[PDB]
């Protein structure tokens, strides 16, 4: 394919650092400037929740689905490249490149695999998500909710497993974010599909001289050398070691809910609910908190993890800057 | 059957607790009245009954159907609703 006690010592020693969460996040995509919250959310998608199966009452998904939405030139697609190369298994694809059959499975009498099936247990990166038709996007409802694919065609009828995490990229209606429309109307996905993402990010091309000088200095510094040694930050982890950390934590660590975490989750859900938050906001909060716990090599979910899960959800969709009654965003607060 | 969110704190506070319990304990939360292998044996037994419509029930059915027709006078209520109501009553008697 393309362990030792020293590796365990290194992993345990790194896990004791105070700046661990920021260190890991800024190290998944070293040359990309800022976008810290986006990097953090992607890191938690890499770790994932915990998988659960009951004797009866079913099984519950550990995987996280993320949507990146906003202005052009904001470097969304560049981030999808890093995720596609970091993940052990996965696929990158485009909206105009995909059919309903190609995305799931194909009759040929034999059955054949599509992208979401090849990507099982990994991450499936979908770019230009706003270009594919309502017919093709309707296929994703069942696979995202259940993590299974049911088929019933001439001579073949069966169900297949798809433990696949989706990372999506799109631009708003009108192709540049319009502040005179509410956020849900700018995003323009129908509610049954928009309800299935754990995190939704707004990223905006806001002009600012302070930001622009730093961005310009960062991009122009890459052309001072033939094959650059330069990198955005002094301390980042090598890709190999980072992969080792993530892989080990996925295999050995399995956090559980503490009573304290249960009380905070109930309180937080009632807070978002009483005023719109659906029942899926609760489950996605649980899943994000579990992902945060694995990343610290803990066996228990605690109050700190729940509060981080809540904070990241509020930060992603620019809620603090949102008018609570009209649903428009004040661009001055960004 | 039409399902609606109907947001209410007194329901949300309980529903959230139920959901968090399912993620906190795997098997323990549900505590059903019967075992599945018990329930299937009961359902197999029940389907052997072939109940018969009582005289008073025949008199009562036309009154209830007239009430539905006057409510109707929304999908328009046809003779098929009476036939369906008879089916449901057969199933209810069989359940008992
Ligand atoms: N913060 C940033 N860090 C690094 N490169 C950036 C940044 N912002 C913009 N760029 C550069 O600007 C370009 C962005 O291209 P791209 O990744 O396609 O952005 P995008 O969000 O996908 N825009 P679009 O495809 O039009 O919706 C690339 O050359 C990036 O290197
Ligand atoms: Mg792009």
Swiss-Prot record, chain A:
Outcome when changing residue 76 to A: Loss of MCM2-7 complex helicase activity
Localization: Nucleus
Protein residues bound to ATP: 70-77
Domain MCM: 20-220
Residue span of motif Arginine finger: 195-198
Family: Belongs to the MCM family.
Record's subunit section: Component of the MCM2-7 complex. The complex forms a toroidal hexameric ring with the proposed subunit order MCM2-MCM6-MCM4-MCM7-MCM3-MCM5; loaded onto DNA, forms a head-head double hexamer.
More about this protein: Present with 8800 molecules/cell in log phase SD medium. Early fractionation of eukaryotic MCM proteins yielded a variety of dimeric, trimeric and tetrameric complexes with unclear biological significance. Specifically a MCM467 subcomplex is shown to have in vitro helicase activity which is inhibited by the MCM2 subunit. The MCM2-7 hexamer is the proposed physiological active complex.
Function: Acts as a component of the MCM2-7 complex (MCM complex) which is the putative replicative helicase essential for 'once per cell cycle' DNA replication initiation and elongation in eukaryotic cells. The active ATPase sites in the MCM2-7 ring are formed through the interaction surfaces of two neighboring subunits such that a critical structure of a conserved arginine finger motif is provided in trans relative to the ATP-binding site of the Walker A box of the adjacent subunit. The six ATPase active sites, however, are likely to contribute differentially to the complex helicase activity.
Designated name of the protein: DNA replication licensing factor MCM4
Species whose genome carries this gene: Saccharomyces cerevisiae (strain ATCC 204508 / S288c) (Baker's yeast)
Name of the gene encoding the protein in the UniProt record: MCM4
Region of the whole protein represented: 468 to 850 of 933
Swiss-Prot record, chain B:
Compartments reported by the entry: Nucleus
Binding partners and assembly: Component of the MCM2-7 complex. The complex forms a toroidal hexameric ring with the proposed subunit order MCM2-MCM6-MCM4-MCM7-MCM3-MCM5; loaded onto DNA, forms a head-head double hexamer. Interacts with MCM10.
Protein name according to UniProt: DNA replication licensing factor MCM6
Stated role: Acts as a component of the MCM2-7 complex (MCM complex) which is the putative replicative helicase essential for 'once per cell cycle' DNA replication initiation and elongation in eukaryotic cells. The active ATPase sites in the MCM2-7 ring are formed through the interaction surfaces of two neighboring subunits such that a critical structure of a conserved arginine finger motif is provided in trans relative to the ATP-binding site of the Walker A box of the adjacent subunit. The six ATPase active sites, however, are likely to contribute differentially to the complex helicase activity.
Native organism taxonomy: Eukaryota, Fungi, Dikarya, Ascomycota, Saccharomycotina
Phosphothreonine modifications at: 54
Other comment: Present with 13400 molecules/cell in log phase SD medium.
Family statement drawn from the similarity comment of this UniProt entry: Belongs to the MCM family.
